[PDB]
Design a protein around this ligand. Structure first.
Ligand SMILES: Nc1nc(=O)c2ncn([C@@H]3O[C@@H]4COP(=O)(O)O[C@H]5[C@@H](O)[C@H](n6cnc7c(N)ncnc76)O[C@@H]5COP(=O)(O)O[C@@H]3[C@@H]4O)c2[nH]1
Lengths: 172, 175
């Protein structure tokens, strides 16, 4: 499957690298370390969308990035791996609000699957793309479920194209 | 195929973004703009065996710095950093002389996950076939890409680990 290769590469080539570094990168962020509501990476997995999170939910906006990890990989001495912090503002019946700060990003391989459906040379119809997205979510779920270094450091968020509601509910 | 998804992702998520920017990043480098004359990304494609550190493998290859980074809003990450490294090659010649070259060279990172998929549900011969399919598909993708034309060189090789400098200098001289 196309999705199985994208899922394993997403683990070996990214999550396995950054998730063991996440807590250290947070603690180095003088601006965010005391603000971060939850110390996990929230990975958005839209099934029919597509990459700006604010355009998916107006209550979520980017406010800053964590300090980058510099990793020697692929002949690149200091390749940059950094996460983004997003602020969630939940309006209430009182007319009041309450703010949260989450480390959240889209699953990047899903963006390539969408790009593969917009070019016929990639041999991916819209129907086949939606199936491969589901296969990607399932394979990535079982890979991370058996991971030692990533244990307790992530949260997968599959949804159909509400994000702020899901994130706030999961934190509670 | 597994290799087809990795090749398309390598194009849509990287090459299609950085190759149209490469010329500009080179010209923005005060130190490297006149030292790098092959203004293209040399992509190493190890086929048989595969460490990813280029400079410790060959005493003639040394990392001497980075180009200016490209910043692209992507996947919810604002200003995600895409940056190339520059390697200096000091090539001894048979007559005792030395010649100095500068290259933008890097490994095709998706191949690293293919080797990781095997050395930790993919047999060795299955990996070798998927690597071959990745190279073929990537060659086809880039051959039809107008925004990547003249900006790349694909280098399939065994993985000769201490022969990269020989391969790069030969390719510069169109050998
Ligand atoms: N959110 C996020 N931030 C990152 O820094 C990151 N780096 C990789 N990935 C995703 O993990 C998976 C495996 O990574 P890999 O390096 O093998 O392939 C990458 C890699 O070969 C190349 N590439 C992308 N960015 C860079 C970069 N900055 N330097 C060198 N190569 C890069 O193009 C491929 C696809 O990139 P992405 O399409 O962004 O998704 C990747 C991929 O799905 C990332 N995802």
């Amino acid at each position: 499957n196309v999705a199985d290769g994208l899922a394993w590469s997403y683990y070996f080539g990214y999550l396995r690298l950054v998730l063991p570094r996440l807590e250290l990168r947070i603690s180095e962020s003088e601006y965010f370390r005391h603000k971060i509501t939850d110390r996990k990476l929230f990975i958005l997995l839209p099934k029919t969308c597509f990459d700006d999170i604010e355009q998916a939910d107006s209550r979520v906006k980017w406010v800053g990035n964590l300090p980058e990890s510099k990793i020697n990989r692929g002949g690149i001495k200091e390749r940059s791996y950094k996460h983004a912090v997003h602020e969630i503002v939940m309006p209430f019946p009182d007319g009041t609000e309450e703010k949260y700060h989450f480390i959240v990003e889209y699953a990047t391989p899903l963006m390539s699957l969408y790009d593969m459906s917009r070019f016929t040379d990639a041999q991916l119809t819209g129907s086949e793309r939606d199936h491969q997205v589901v296969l990607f979510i399932r394979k990535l779920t079982e890979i991370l479920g058996k991971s030692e270094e990533c244990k307790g450091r992530y949260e997968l968020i599959p949804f159909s194209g509400k994000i702020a509601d899901i994130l706030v509910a999961l934190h509670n």
